[PDB]
Design an enzyme around this catalytic site. Sequence first.
Site, mmCIF file in Angstrom:
data_model
loop_
_atom_site.group_PDB
_atom_site.id
_atom_site.type_symbol
_atom_site.label_atom_id
_atom_site.label_comp_id
_atom_site.label_asym_id
_atom_site.label_seq_id
_atom_site.Cartn_x
_atom_site.Cartn_y
_atom_site.Cartn_z
ATOM 1 N N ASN A 98 -8.539 5.797 3.547
ATOM 2 C CA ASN A 98 -9.232 6.671 2.611
ATOM 3 C C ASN A 98 -10.013 7.758 3.341
ATOM 4 O O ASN A 98 -10.494 7.565 4.460
ATOM 5 C CB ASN A 98 -10.174 5.849 1.727
ATOM 6 N N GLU B 40 0.821 -1.207 0.000
ATOM 7 C CA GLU B 40 0.000 0.000 0.000
ATOM 8 C C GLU B 40 0.856 1.260 0.000
ATOM 9 O O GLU B 40 0.501 2.253 -0.642
ATOM 10 C CB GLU B 40 -0.941 0.010 1.208
ATOM 11 N N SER C 108 -11.272 11.601 -3.372
ATOM 12 C CA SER C 108 -10.739 11.201 -2.082
ATOM 13 C C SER C 108 -9.232 10.976 -2.176
ATOM 14 O O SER C 108 -8.655 10.880 -3.263
ATOM 15 C CB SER C 108 -11.430 9.932 -1.585
ATOM 16 N N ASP D 201 -12.259 9.659 -7.488
ATOM 17 C CA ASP D 201 -13.437 10.228 -6.847
ATOM 18 C C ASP D 201 -13.124 11.441 -5.976
ATOM 19 O O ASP D 201 -13.999 11.885 -5.226
ATOM 20 C CB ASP D 201 -14.144 9.155 -6.013
ATOM 21 N N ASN E 236 -7.385 9.579 -5.495
ATOM 22 C CA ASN E 236 -8.236 8.693 -6.273
ATOM 23 C C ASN E 236 -9.091 9.507 -7.240
ATOM 24 O O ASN E 236 -9.183 10.734 -7.150
ATOM 25 C CB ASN E 236 -9.115 7.843 -5.349
ATOM 26 N N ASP F 233 -5.926 8.708 -0.169
ATOM 27 C CA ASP F 233 -5.480 7.683 0.762
ATOM 28 C C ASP F 233 -4.245 8.181 1.500
ATOM 29 O O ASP F 233 -3.324 8.727 0.885
ATOM 30 C CB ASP F 233 -5.168 6.383 0.022
#
Length: 129
Positions: A59, A35, A50, A48, A46, A52
């Site tokens: 998120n 990750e 958002s 959308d 991301n 991370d």
Amino acid sequence: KVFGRCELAAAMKRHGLDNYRGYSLGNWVCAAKFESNFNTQATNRNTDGSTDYGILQINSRWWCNDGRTPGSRNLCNIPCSALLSSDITASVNCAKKIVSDGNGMNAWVAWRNRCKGTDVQAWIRGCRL
């Protein structure tokens, strides 16, 4: 901070992650390797809107507040920058909430696709735990 492999494993073990919800410590270290490459300062946007945050790439849509994800929740009740610190306490406590959500560690896409069903034990081999 960019953790070492056995340095991280010892940190997550001390914060109660070994076998938390049945996921052995190797699942968490493998998931953190893919990750974030063990980097506490990792961020990724991301599609959308958002983002991370942190070593486990938590998120901003439901878990932390970064003030720029509209209509999002803050279920871990923390700013996303708190997930970026060299002290992983905030990241571990929030991940405990995420892994209990119902879907388990499948909430991390890199774990599902690169750790699930593997010999995750090789990720703590040689570590003085």
